[PDB]
Design a protein around this ligand. Structure first.
Ligand SMILES: CC1([C@@H]2CC(=O)N(CCOc3ccc(F)c(C#N)c3)C2)CCS(=O)(=O)CC1
Ligand SMILES: [Cl-]
Ligand code: NA
Length: 370
C-alpha cells in the first residue's frame, strides 16, 4: 500500500487534459478535499501504461500483460473526483516524473503534500521520456475518446547528449505551461477538460495562493526542476529528488537564482552527478543537500511500495531503509524547505533540522567524495 498522507487534510485526485492535443497539458491533480467517502484512485489506469513499462524494462511486450495482471487493480489512497476543500488559498507544486515513469507514479509524494494543504499538479510529459502517454489527434477524436498513444523513445549512445537536452527543455516548457493553465483556471477562465470526468474545474477558481509556487521532481524530473527554475521566475523554489544532471546544458548552472534543495539517495549518486550539482552552488544562492541513509534511487517513486520487502530489495525498488521511513524524511524535509522559501504560515518548520540532515537516517550534504 502506498501510504496515506500524514497531514490533517483529506486528499482528492483528478485528471486534467487541456488542450486535447500532444502540445496540450496533461496532469494529475492532488488536492485538499472535504469528502472522504469517495472511491480510491486507480494507480495505473490504462493498459497501455503497462505496455510502456514493459518496453522501458526492455522485456517482451507480454511482460506488460503480466504487470497489468499484478498491478492493474491497485489503488492509491486519494478520493477520486472529490470536491475541493473550500475556504482557503493553497500553494502549488508542479511535479515532474522520471524517465520511463508517468504522471500517476509519485502519488505517495503528491498525496502527502496535498494532505498538508498543497495543490499538486503532476505533469505527464510528451517528450517521449514517459513509458507511455496519450492525447487526441483532433476534436472529433477527443469527443469519442479515441486515444492516440506515444511510447518511450530508446536512444542510441550518439543521440544521448543532444536528445536528453531537447527533452529537458521541453519538460521545462511543459512545467511552465501547466503552471499557466492552473493560474488561468484560478483566474476563472472556463476550460473544457478533454477528459470527461465528474470534477468541475470551476471549483479551482480563487483557490490558489498565486505567488506560492514551487517545482519538484525525481531524477529526470530533478533536472527538469533546475531547467524550469532557470526559465521561469514564477517558480519561487525547487526541490530535486535524486537529480540526474546529465540532461542539463552547461549554460544553466550559473542561471538559477531561486532556492534549490537536493534530496539524494545513498546508493544512486556518483561523482560526475555530484560535481554537476555543486556547479549550481554560488555564495549568493540558497542551496541545501541531504542524503537519506540506506536508500536507493527508487525510494522516491511509488513502486517502492508495490511489492514485498524481499522481492522489492531484489529489484532495487527498496533499500535497507524502510520505504515509509525514507519517504517520510523526504516529504517532511520538503515541507520545511517549502515553508521557508514560499513564506508559508503553517507548522512545517518543526522539520527544519531535516533540511540540515540532522537525523540518524540522514547524512548532511553527500556521502560521495569529489
Ligand atoms: C538515471 C537513469 C534514469 C533517469 C530517471 O528519470 N530515472 C528514474 C526512473 O524512475 C522510474 C521509472 C519508472 C517507474 F515506473 C518508476 C516508478 N514508480 C520510476 C532513472 C537514466 C540514465 S541510465 O539509463 O544510465 C540509469 C537510469
Ligand atoms: Cl562518476
Ligand atoms: Na519562461
Amino acid at each position: 500500500k502506498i501510504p496515506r498522507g500524514n497531514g490533517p487534510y483529506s486528499v482528492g485526485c483528478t485528471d486534467l487534459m487541456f488542450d486535447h492535443t500532444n502540445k496540450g497539458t496533461f496532469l494529475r491533480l492532488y488536492y485538499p478535499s472535504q469528502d472522504n467517502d469517495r472511491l480510491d484512485t486507480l494507480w495505473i489506469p490504462n493498459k497501455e501504461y503497462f505496455w510502456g513499462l514493459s518496453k522501458f524494462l526492455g522485456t517482451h511486450w507480454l511482460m506488460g500483460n503480466i504487470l497489468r495482471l499484478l498491478f492493474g487493480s491497485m489503488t492509491t489512497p486519494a478520493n477520486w473526483n472529490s470536491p475541493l476543500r473550500p475556504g482557503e488559498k493553497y500553494p502549488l507544486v508542479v511535479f515532474s516524473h522520471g524517465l520511463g515513469a508517468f504522471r500517476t507514479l509519485y502519488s505517495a509524494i503528491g498525496i502527502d503534500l496535498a494532505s498538508h494543504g498543497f495543490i499538486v499538479a503532476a505533469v505527464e510529459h510528451r517528450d517521449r521520456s514517459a513509458s507511455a502517454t496519450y492525447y487526441f489527434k483532433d476534436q472529433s477524436a477527443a469527443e469519442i475518446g479515441d486515444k492516440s498513444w506515444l511510447y518511450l523513445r530508446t536512444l542510441k549512445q550518439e543521440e544521448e547528449t543532444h536528445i536528453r537536452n531537447e527533452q529537458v527543455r521541453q519538460r521545462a516548457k511543459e512545467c511552465s505551461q501547466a503552471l499557466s493553465l492552473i493560474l488561468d483556471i484560478d483566474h476563472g477562465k472556463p476550460v473544457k477538460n478533454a477528459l470527461d470526468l465528474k470534477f468541475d474545474m470551476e471549483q479551482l477558481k480563487d483557490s490558489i495562493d498565486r505567488e506560492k509556487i514551487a517545482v519538484i521532481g525525481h531524477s529526470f524530473g530533478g533536472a527538469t526542476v533546475i531547467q524550469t527554475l532557470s526559465e521561469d521566475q514564477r517558480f519561487r523554489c525547487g526541490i530535486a529528488l535524486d537529480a540526474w544532471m546529465f540532461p542539463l546544458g552547461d549554460e544553466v548552472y550559473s542561471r538559477i537564482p531561486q532556492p534549490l534543495f537536493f534530496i539524494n539517495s545513498e546508493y544512486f549518486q556518483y561523482p560526475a552527478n555530484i560535481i554537476k550539482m555543486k556547479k549550481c552552488y554560488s555564495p549568493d544562492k540558497e542551496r541545501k543537500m541531504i542524503t537519506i541513509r540506506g536508500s536507493v534511487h527508487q525510494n522516491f517513486a511509488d513502486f517502492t511500495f508495490a511489492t514485498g520487502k524481499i522481492i522489492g530489495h531484489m529489484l532495487k525498488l527498496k533499500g535497507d531503509i524502510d520505504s515509509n521511513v525514507a519517504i517520510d524524511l523526504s516529504n517532511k524535509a520538503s515541507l520545511a524547505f517549502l515553508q521557508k522559501h514560499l513564506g508559508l504560515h503553517k507548522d512545517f518548520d518543526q522539520w527544519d533540522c531535516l533540511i540540515e540532515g540532522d537525523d540518524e537516517n540522514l547524512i548532511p550534504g553527500t556521502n560521495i567524495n569529489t
